[PDB]
Amino acid sequence: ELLKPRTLADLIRILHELFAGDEVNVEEVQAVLEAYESNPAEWALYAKFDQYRYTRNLVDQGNGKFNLMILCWGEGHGSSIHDHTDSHCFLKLLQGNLKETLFDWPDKKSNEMIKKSERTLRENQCAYINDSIGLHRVENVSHTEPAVSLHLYSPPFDTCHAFDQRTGHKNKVTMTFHSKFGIRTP
Numbered sequence: 245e246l247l248k249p250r251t252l253a254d255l256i257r258i259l260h261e262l263f264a265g266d267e268v269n270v271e272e273v274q275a276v277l278e279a280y281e282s283n284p285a286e287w288a289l290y291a292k293f294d295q296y297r298y299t300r301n302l303v304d305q306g307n308g309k310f311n312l313m314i315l316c317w318g319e320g321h322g323s324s325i326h327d328h329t330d331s332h333c334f335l336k337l338l339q340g341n342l343k344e345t346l347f348d349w350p351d352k353k354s355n356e357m358i359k360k361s362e363r364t365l366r367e368n369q370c371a372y373i374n375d376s377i378g379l380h381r382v383e384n385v386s387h388t389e390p391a392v393s394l395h396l397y398s399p400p401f402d403t404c405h406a407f408d409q410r411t412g413h414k415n416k417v418t419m420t421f422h423s424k425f426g427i428r429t430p
């Protein structure tokens with residue numbers, strides 16, 4: 245039974261229930277993420293920005309079933325084109341807007357990766373990606389508004405691949421957390 249999360253803490257409690265089993269009902273998880281109305285006071289602890297690039301700030305470890313984290317995107321900050329290591333990946337906007345660009349898995353032949361589509365993700369909207377859908381890049385293209393997003397990955401993963409847009413070539417990358425549970429972790 246899916247109820248509206250009243251607060252971020254409530255959302256977390258609901259997620260623990262939804263991930264208590266061995267599978268994941270994606271539509272249910274997306275619906276609950278979308279239903280949480282971003283309240284900046286509740287996540288200010290985690291919203292730690294860096295001048296030069298976006299930051300990943302761990303919020304909850306899901307009793308081992310998922311990682312929930314907050315990403316903070318300065319003006320003009322964006323990601324690489326990347327995959328999600330055979331995991332579910334949900335993204336919900338807490339502040340600002342992000343541009344998501346979708347790409348196909350490259351062929352073994354060296355070629356320009358062409359975008360399959362783009363969309364603008366707006367405050368409170370929750371998107372979903374997985375490797376069967378394709379790859380993506382996420383970017384804050386704003387010149388005037390920082391963005392903040394809430395991401396859930398299940399199972400948790402700390403490595404993925406970045407793809408070169410000009411060739412499709414992939415390189416393994418290890419993601420790092422800027423902070424964990426509100427504490428900066430250099």
Ligand SMILES: N[C@@H](CSOO)C(=O)O
Binds near residue numbers: 323
């Ligand atoms: N995959 C990127 C964020 S775009 O992923 O929804 C990351 O976790 O750093």
Ligand SMILES: [Fe+2]
Binds near residue numbers: 327382
């Ligand atoms: Fe991503």
